[PDB]
Amino acid sequence: DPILLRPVDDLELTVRSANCLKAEAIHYIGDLVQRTEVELLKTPNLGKKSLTEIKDVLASRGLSLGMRLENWP
C-alpha cells in the first residue's frame, strides 16, 4: 500500500499535533491509524480541532479510522 508506508509528515498538521505525534512515537500513518477516538482525546494538549483536521485529511486522502493492520512490521 503506497499510502500506508508514507511518512507521518504528510498529514499537514500543526506544530501542536506534530509534537503530540512525536511524543506518541509513531512516524508512520499506517501505524497511526490504528488508534481510536477515545485514546486520541485522552492524550493531553489534543483538542477536537486536531481530531477534526486529521479526520478531514484522512477522508480527503481515502482513509478512515477503526480499521486494523495485519502482518504490519
Binding site: 511518512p7 509528515d9 504528510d10 499537514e12 486522502r61
Partner: protein, 50 residues
C-alpha cells in the same frame, strides 16, 4: 517578478504593506516551509529533468 513588469525589494514591499522587514522575512519563511511540506507541488517536483 511574477505577473508584473518588475519585482520589488523586501524593504519596499514591507513599506507598502506596513509590515516590518523581519516580519516580512518570517512570513516568507513560513510560506516557503509550507510549500516544502509534502502532499503538494508534486508537478513542481516533476518539473526537474534530471
Amino acid at each position: 517578478g511574477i505577473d508584473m513588469n518588475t519585482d520589488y525589494t523586501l524593504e519596499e514591499v514591507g513599506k507598502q504593506f506596513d509590515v516590518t522587514r523581519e516580519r516580512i522575512r518570517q512570513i516568507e519563511a513560513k510560506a516557503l516551509r509550507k510549500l516544502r511540506h509534502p502532499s503538494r507541488s508534486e508537478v513542481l517536483r516533476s518539473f526537474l529533468d534530471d
